[PDB]
């Protein structure tokens, strides 16, 4: 509801950004290894087995709870058996929608002060974000980044409208339906990502401040958090824990500020991120002076408050991620704070100053500085788009674990755009596993071999008579694979083959182990293969096992596995589900969550209080 040039300008700018961003995300097509882990859970859920990684166990492997079910719905609607295309389409659409939403939300912030004026809208903070090459790397992978972008854009627009909605129509701020919708949207943040709660919850607090009475506060708090409470109850009843389990596997001991600073420097130095920040701060502090240099309830619901809320949210997210320790990818975890910090300057107005503040030649010089600053920002973006990137250090393991994943997997395979699971069959140990499985009708345990790029085989116990014969379509024994990269194996082997890792993403035994040494980020807490041999229907004697395994350790682990307290936790996720199982799992989730075991079997025996088995000799 403003003048014609203001209406058209904004529109064209938006279109431009969208187009470019789309192109920038089509020339870099790939799917990550971590993106193929969601698809196995989706396949299990569409097969009638439930939200699990393996059919016989109830283990949570996805930390989004919304991306997984959205992809499940998409794969249910689409009758095609390919799920990578669903993920590609959804990620692209969500990223573009989020950028459009944030631009439209920022325009309404400046709209009220442009009444009866001639001005234009120019894209400032939207171009900067899409100029960064890692932003276009992760705009199309199998992760949930686009979902985060869309959620943040919607929340920003709704909060701006809520802050500006104060007009006192009938002694009330806004309508009740809008308040309920905003409360539900704010409460829905913990499901999307856990650390995002600090954003959404903050918004909720503001609403609770502005309510006139206690009745409205109770209504808002009840409406806001119904769905997260229901899902928490379901998770406690079904999985027997208070947390997804991947967070349970890590056993933190404190802050790591030095690694976070190293990660921040590594992110900054390819692209020189300080110059756009300085220029955008200059533009922001310059645009405010033209508008003019110049109880708690009125103050909280004001346009000045939402800007501070967004900036504080961005700073808090950055501090949390820096204290955590960073990541082993180039720029993955520092994009959400960057998106949050650039929201208030996503689009800027350019206009001739009023006659009542500066006369004639003083207004002709105020627009020139704004134009020159915008031109400098555009030049920086154009330069930084065509940047080589991290450099010739993203293909090996250096002193730090940070690496560029897209080029790593492009050279690991032989494809410039690895998009499907058939493209990942060219990994060095991928074609051999199929033949290894096909050559063992009675089943086996597969381990990496230290001499070549094939697999070592540990056979299983043969079936007894009258059980081998009573089989449908022949008899197939149990197959288990022990490895570190799960997505490529999980999307290839099949739904009746058990795929386990060592850190504890899908291994319930390795997630209950304690920590002794810090080591490298993410590649520091690995379980011995002797534990894997100990549990499973496989042989345990030297004529059938490789020479780098210790049989005394195998016997000690086998004897330690019969602890009464370990048995309860094991059957919490393996016994058939019913009503009493749901109730017992709800009552004992807290104590199951805070349970730890020791890596070395002898010390475990010592802790539990069980006798030591005699030497095999």
């Amino acid at each position, epitope marked *: 509801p403003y003048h014609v040039w203001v209406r058209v300008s904004l529109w064209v700018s938006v279109v431009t950004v969208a187009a470019l961003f789309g192109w920038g995300a089509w020339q870099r097509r790939w799917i990550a290894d971590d993106g193929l882990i969601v698809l196995r859970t989706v396949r299990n859920l569409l097969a009638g087995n439930g939200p699990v990684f393996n059919a016989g166990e109830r283990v949570e492997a996805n930390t989004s709870t919304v991306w997984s079910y959205l992809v499940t719905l998409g794969g249910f609607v689409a009758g095609s058996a390919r799920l990578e295309y669903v993920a590609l389409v959804l990620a692209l659409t969500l990223s573009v929608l989020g950028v459009v939403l944030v631009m439209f939300g920022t325009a309404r912030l400046y709209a009220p002060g442009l009444t009866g004026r001639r001005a234009v809208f120019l894209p400032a903070g939207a171009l900067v974000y899409i100029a960064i090459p890692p932003a276009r790397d992760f705009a199309t992978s199998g992760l949930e980044n686009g979902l985060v972008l869309a959620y943040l854009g919607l929340l920003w627009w709704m909060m701006v409208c809520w802050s500006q909605g104060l007009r006192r129509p009938d002694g009330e701020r806004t309508s009740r339906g809008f308040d309920a919708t905003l409360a539900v949207v704010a409460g829905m943040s913990v499901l999307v990502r856990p650390e995002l709660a600090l954003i959404g919850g903050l918004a909720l607090v503001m609403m609770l401040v502005a309510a006139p009475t206690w009745r409205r506060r109770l209504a808002l708090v009840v409406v806001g958090g119904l769905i997260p409470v229901a899902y928490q109850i379901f998770r406690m009843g079904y999985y027997g824990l208070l947390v997804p389990g991947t967070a349970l596997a890590k056993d933190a001991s404190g802050a790591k500020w030095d690694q976070g600073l190293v990660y921040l420097a590594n992110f900054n130095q390819p692209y020189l991120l300080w110059a756009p920040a300085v220029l955008l701060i200059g533009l922001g502090l310059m645009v405010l002076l033209l508008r003019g240099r110049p109880w708690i309830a009125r103050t909280v619901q004001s346009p000045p408050a939402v800007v501070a809320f967004m900036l504080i949210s961005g700073l808090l997210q950055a501090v949390y991620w820096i204290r955590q320790g960073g990541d082993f990818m180039h720029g993955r975890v520092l994009l959400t704070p960057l998106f949050c910090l650039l929201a208030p300057v996503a689009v800027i107005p350019l206009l001739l100053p009023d006659r009542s503040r500066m006369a004639r030649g003083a207004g002709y010089l105020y627009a020139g500085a704004t134009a020159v600053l915008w031109l400098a920002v555009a030049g920086w973006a154009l330069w930084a788009a065509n940047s080589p990137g991290m450099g010739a250090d993203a293909t090996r*393991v250096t002193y*730090s674990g940070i690496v560029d994943e897209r080029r790593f997997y492009s050279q690991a395979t032989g494809h410039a755009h690895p998009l499907t699971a058939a493209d990942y069959l060219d990994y060095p140990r991928m074609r051999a596993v199929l033949t290894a499985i096909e050559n063992t009708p009675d089943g086996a345990l597969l381990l990496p071999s*230290g001499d070549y790029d094939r697999w070592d085989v540990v056979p299983a116990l043969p079936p007894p008579p009258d059980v081998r014969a009573a089989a449908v379509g022949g008899y197939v024994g149990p197959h288990t694979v022990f490895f570190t990269n799960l997505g490529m194996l999980g999307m290839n082997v099949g739904l009746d083959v058990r795929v386990i890792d060592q850190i504890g993403l899908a291994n319930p035994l390795a997630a209950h182990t304690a920590r002794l040494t810090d080591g490298r980020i993410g590649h*520091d807490k690995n379980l011995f293969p002797d534990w894997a041999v100990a549990e499973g229907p496989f042989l345990k004697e030297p004529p059938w096992i490789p020479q780098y395994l210790d049989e005394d350790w195998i016997r000690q682990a086998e004897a330690a596995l019969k602890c009464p307290e370990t048995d309860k936790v094991l059957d919490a996720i393996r016994a058939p589900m019913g009503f009493r199982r749901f109730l017992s799992n709800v009552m004992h989730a807290a104590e199951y969550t805070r349970y730890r075991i020791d890596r070395v079997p002898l010390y475990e025996l010592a802790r539990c209080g069980l006798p030591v088995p005699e030497p095999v000799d």
Partner: antibody, heavy 125, light 109 residues
Framework: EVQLVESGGGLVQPGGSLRLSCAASGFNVSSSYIHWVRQAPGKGLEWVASISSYYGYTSYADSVKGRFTISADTSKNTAYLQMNSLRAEDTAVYYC??????????????????WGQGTLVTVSS | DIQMTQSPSSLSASVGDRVTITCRASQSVSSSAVAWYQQKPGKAPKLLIYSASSLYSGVPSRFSGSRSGTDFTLTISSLQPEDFATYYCQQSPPYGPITFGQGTKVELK
């Protein structure tokens, strides 16, 4: 070329503390086993402690189990050995060494490949 | 606890002779991870034999090892003047503790 450079050592009062360092070149300490071995004057060899960063495993001898401490700083490729309550019979030349690993995965043959030069520690006074 | 008894303790041999050193354990040695080392006075040890029957890279062919049940043996045929040192037998499981033996010394006459 693989190199192991050792530093930190001298005279210490009985009941004192002294730390040892070892810098590695040519390989990553995150995928190999590191051992400490000492040799008392006119005596044989004696294993002290070992560490594995890939597995989070740490082991000590029975004589120095509660008083010594071995760690690793993968950011600088360095290994450490803290020594506390140094009784007078802890004087010897201390060696750092690397294990002989399999080529295609993280397994060991049970032997030692490369030995450092050594750094003597005198715990008498 | 595993203990290794190395014998003999001192050998007198001349140039171009055959030398045999035997290291003996007590318990089961199914690990078969016995390794042999060489150390000259004032230097660090050098690896010669690993897995009790396998010869390391760069080591001359004169050195050999054999597993006679619980007994282990090192063999040198036609020693050269650059072979007079002190030797050690070592045992270790895949993760377990390292155990050494009492060194032997060879002289020249």
């Amino acid at each position: 070329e693989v190199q192991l450079v050792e530093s930190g050592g001298g005279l210490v009062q009985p009941g004192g503390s002294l730390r040892l360092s070892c810098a590695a070149s040519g390989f990553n300490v995150s995928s190999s086993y590191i051992h400490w071995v000492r040799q008392a004057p006119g005596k044989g060899l004696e294993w002290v402690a070992s560490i594995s960063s890939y597995y989070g495993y740490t082991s000590y001898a029975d004589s120095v189990k509660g008083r010594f401490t071995i760690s690793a700083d993968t950011s600088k490729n360095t290994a450490y050995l803290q020594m506390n309550s140094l009784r007078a019979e802890d004087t010897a030349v201390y060696y750092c060494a690397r294990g002989y690993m399999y080529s295609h995965w993280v397994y060991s043959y049970g032997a030692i490949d490369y030995w450092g030069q050594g750094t003597l520690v005198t715990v008498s006074s | 606890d595993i203990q290794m008894t190395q014998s003999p303790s001192s050998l007198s041999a001349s140039v171009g002779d055959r030398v045999t050193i035997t290291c003996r354990a007590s318990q089961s040695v199914s690990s078969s991870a016995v390794a042999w080392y060489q150390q000259k006075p004032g230097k660090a040890p050098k690896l010669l034999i690993y897995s009790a029957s396998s010869l390391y890279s760069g080591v001359p062919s004169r050195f050999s090892g054999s597993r006679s049940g619980t007994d282990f043996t090192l063999t040198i045929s036609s020693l050269q003047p650059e072979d007079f040192a002190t030797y050690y037998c070592q045992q270790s499981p895949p993760y377990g503790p390292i155990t050494f033996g009492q060194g032997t010394k060879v002289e020249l006459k």
